[model samples]
Target: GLSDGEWQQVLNVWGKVEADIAGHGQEVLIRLFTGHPETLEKFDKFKHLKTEAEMKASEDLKKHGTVVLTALGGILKKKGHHEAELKPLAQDHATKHKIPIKYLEFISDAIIHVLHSKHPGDFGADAQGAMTKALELFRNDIAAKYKELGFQG
Candidate 1:
């Protein structure tokens, strides 16, 4: 639940960088895999890519990265209104991929990190807190679906 002001800040900061959707998404994914190499093993399409360069050059990586960033863009646009959008994704990750909730949290961290790096002046503690809160809300929704499917991880 973000205050109106917090939501505005999120929109402002995100709008500033959303133009480079693919780049931002690729960067976040690269950072996620770099920081947690083991996580890459979960992505069958990406696990074979041994290095960041390899992953970056991958067409599959580009496609998935674009999907990820696009989803984030949609969430940012809708602010707190996301259940309709997130449920399907949650179902896929839980039942199809069986991805653990922690990885989603990791992706949130990567998003925040990328925002901080890209907009250092705008990503202060207040903005960081707001982003974290918003992301947690999304994570919670996904977790609920994950639990509903009897996937515990």
Candidate 2:
């Protein structure tokens, strides 16, 4: 859908990437990860945990958190906590905040990536900004929590 010059510009970026990195960059392929089949199944199951008690009792919160962490970690391992630690923490945070677990997992993953890029090693005010942006991505209680986490109105 691009003009010849535009297409050439795109190719130029690819060429530079290939030249700078090993594997000819031809060895690398990119695809948008919408979700795995298992993740879809998990989402279906998670949808059922609507009530507060159901969410508290169900393992979907933890499992989905781990799924998001592992899935995102595959691309950006240095950005976020590993699935093991992040799973329970994400679930607990979701429960404590009374937000949907899926939203919590997604926001947490976003926070991790943003912090990884912004702070790299240490977390401080920038970490709060990332968290605020992530919470704003979701509506309802998630957005409210973003405000509680020091986001401006």
Candidate 3:
């Protein structure tokens, strides 16, 4: 549970990310990161602890990058466009980044499955622009924050 301020921040971030998905065709604005295989293996072994350590290590800093990406589909699902909206974003981002687009396809399929499981309907584009705007803002914000926090190539 987040405090009021924290919860608002969360919603604002969500709104920003959602906007990007709406505007950019959903495949253009999803988030992904590359990490050392060993680091990821460590994370797999002790993810709960690693998450705690990351938070502790980033005092006065936001720790939402990974969480935001992980939760994005579920969040969109909750908003009733999880599958239809996010799949394209994931695909587009992969294409733009020149990474393999297979991951995006996986994400899209997963979201679609989840959405269908929840409810059956045609996913309309009513909130597309708003969602895309939100996503772009969030992506810029988080990317800059990552640089500020010493993210390096």
Candidate 4:
């Protein structure tokens, strides 16, 4: 639900970082693991990597990180109109992966943080606010599916 100008700003910032997906994706995963260590336990493939450096060097982490960034890139391209696309992702995570919604929140925050740090001038308050709202919509759509499956968290 971003205004035209906000959408422009977000897309502008995204374009700057999208080309370096691996770098920014790695940074996002690193931030998530550092901020919430327990999250590592959920990823069987990634849990063995004890140190941040080890995790960053992991091929599995890089692959999954790139997937996440690419998915977000798709959503961003839709200008916040494809939030419904998150429903399937949420169902898969909740039902198959058993990832709680909280981790999604953490990852979303990590993404915003990365965007801000990577493109400080472009991700100003207005753009950040719009991005936050868009993410909130995406998360909410996912949470609804989780709720349907009787997930309390």
For all candidates in order, the CA lDDT equals 0.84, 0.38, 0.37, 0.83
TM-score of 3: 0.28
Clashing pairs in 2: none
Estimate, for each residue in 56-86, the C-alpha lDDT of model 4 and write its tens digit: 6787788888898898888878876774667
Question: For candidate 1, lDDT tens digit of each residue in 1-153?
Answer: 888998987787777667887788888899999998888998888888898789879878877888988887797788878888888989988888878999998999999898878877867887778778888888888888888899986
Worst 10 residues of 3 by lDDT: 25-34
Clashes of each: 0, 0, 25, 0
TM-score of each: 0.91, 0.29, 0.28, 0.89
* Per-residue accuracy of model 3 over 1-153 as CA lDDT, tens digit each: 223444344454454445443322222212111222222232332243335345334422223333435466465334432445454544444334332333434334443333333334533243333344444433443344344444332
- lDDT, candidate 3, residue 54? 53
Off by over 4 Å in 3: 1-42, 45-122
Query: What are the RMSDs of all candidates, in order?
Result: 1.5, 16.5, 14.5, 1.8
Better model by lDDT: candidate 3 vs candidate 4: 4
Choose the strongest candidate by lDDT. 1
